[PDB]
Amino acid sequence: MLGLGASDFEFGVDPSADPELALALRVSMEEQRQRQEEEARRAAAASAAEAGIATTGTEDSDDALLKMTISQQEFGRTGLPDLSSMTEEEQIAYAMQMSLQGAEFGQAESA
Amino acid sequence: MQIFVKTLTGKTITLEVEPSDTIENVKAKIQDKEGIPPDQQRLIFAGKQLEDGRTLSDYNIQKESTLHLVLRLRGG
Amino acid sequence: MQIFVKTLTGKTITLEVEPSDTIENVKAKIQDKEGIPPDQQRLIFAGKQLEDGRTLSDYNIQKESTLHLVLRLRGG
């Protein structure tokens, strides 16, 4: 059966049935906005000062040390078949490479 | 790795844990510090209730990771 | 017919199945042997991902057929 009651479920179903679960999901949405705004604004300022269409000067010293230092460290050390670096398509590129480009038969294998 | 756990009153707690620790174990830690029962504690990461059987690594929780803690009730 | 399923760790698994079995049924078999959830599994063969509703015959699969299983993760 399905059990159409009220006590059978009143907390693990929706946040509307609990002011603690409704406020918990509202506090998380606010935090994501700070990351989506502080990050979306950082890219909006780099594009406005790329051609010269706003009141800016030269803001690329603190982030340059964060990007230049992480650009050579994050994309510099790679001497091993790390699987974590391969995404779902990169990992698929290896599994598909042996399935599509992995077969030694030719027209001389009568066995 | 010390992780941070916020509450519904602007209060964050730091607990030395690991990526292989179970959520139930973390709830017990906050129960010894704040003095609150684990049954009345709900761990939610960025809007994701953690399972008592799963660990912190199952939710990509790294060191200094913030976790939204909530207080559950018994009927009402 | 027992088919072989190779993963991304130099490991292969054998499962007694049939040409009329659904891919979701195969993922469930590997979930009982290795202990991994089916939602986190991706069956790929001949450079083609298999659907969970399709079966093994829909992709021309026979006994002792090798497959490429992958593990999917989440982030949010």
UniProtKB/Swiss-Prot annotation, chain A:
Segments for region (Essential for ubiquitin-binding): 21-25, 92-96
Domain UIM stretches: 16-35, 87-106
For the modification Phosphoserine, the affected residues are S61, S71
Give the span(s) annotated as Interaction with UBQLN1: 2-67
Which residues are recorded as modified (Phosphothreonine)? T55, T58
Q: Where is the composition biased (Basic and acidic residues)?
A: 29-42
Q: Where is this region: Disordered?
A: 29-60
Role according to the record: Component of the 26S proteasome, a multiprotein complex involved in the ATP-dependent degradation of ubiquitinated proteins. This complex plays a key role in the maintenance of protein homeostasis by removing misfolded or damaged proteins, which could impair cellular functions, and by removing proteins whose functions are no longer required. Therefore, the proteasome participates in numerous cellular processes, including cell cycle progression, apoptosis, or DNA damage repair.
Q: Can you tell me which family this protein belongs to?
A: Belongs to the proteasome subunit S5A family.
> How is the quaternary structure described?
Component of the 19S proteasome regulatory particle complex. The 26S proteasome consists of a 20S core particle (CP) and two 19S regulatory subunits (RP). The regulatory particle is made of a lid composed of 9 subunits, a base containing 6 ATPases and few additional components including PSMD4. Interacts with NUB1. Interacts with SQSTM1. Interacts with UBQLN4. Interacts with UBE3A. Interacts with UBQLN1 (via ubiquitin-like domain). Interacts with DDI2.
Comment on protein domains: The 2 UIM motifs are involved in the binding to a multi-ubiquitin chain in a cooperative way.
Query: What's the name of the protein?
Result: 26S proteasome non-ATPase regulatory subunit 4
Q: Which organism is it from?
A: Homo sapiens (Human)
Swiss-Prot record, chains B, C:
- Which residues are annotated as modified residue (Microbial infection) ADP-ribosylthreonine in the UniProt record? T66
Q: What is the effect of changing K63R?
A: Abolishes HLTF-mediated polyubiquitination of PCNA
Post-translational modification, as annotated: Phosphorylated at Ser-65 by PINK1 during mitophagy. Phosphorylated ubiquitin specifically binds and activates parkin (PRKN), triggering mitophagy. Phosphorylation does not affect E1-mediated E2 charging of ubiquitin but affects discharging of E2 enzymes to form polyubiquitin chains. It also affects deubiquitination by deubiquitinase enzymes such as USP30. Mono-ADP-ribosylated at the C-terminus by PARP9, a component of the PPAR9-DTX3L complex. ADP-ribosylation requires processing by E1 and E2 enzymes and prevents ubiquitin conjugation to substrates such as histones.
Q: Where is the Ubiquitin-like domain?
A: 1-76
Q: Enter cross-link residues for Glycyl lysine isopeptide (Lys-Gly) (interchain with G-Cter in ubiquitin).
A: K6, K11, K27, K29, K33, K48, K63
Q: What is the effect of changing G76A?
A: Loss of ADP-ribosylation
Residues with ADP-ribosylglycine modification = G76
Positions in coiled-coil regions: none
User: What is the recorded phenotype of mutating R72G?
Assistant: No effect on ADP-ribosylation
Give all Phosphoserine modified positions: S65
| Covalent link location (Glycyl lysine isopeptide (Gly-Lys) (interchain with K-? in acceptor proteins)) | G76
What domain of life does the native source organism fall in? Eukaryota
- Record site feature (Interacts with activating enzyme), residues: R54, R72
Protein task: Exists either covalently attached to another protein, or free (unanchored). When covalently bound, it is conjugated to target proteins via an isopeptide bond either as a monomer (monoubiquitin), a polymer linked via different Lys residues of the ubiquitin (polyubiquitin chains) or a linear polymer linked via the initiator Met of the ubiquitin (linear polyubiquitin chains).
Name it.
Ubiquitin
Organism of origin:
Homo sapiens
Q: Which residues of the full protein are shown?
A: 1 to 76 of 128
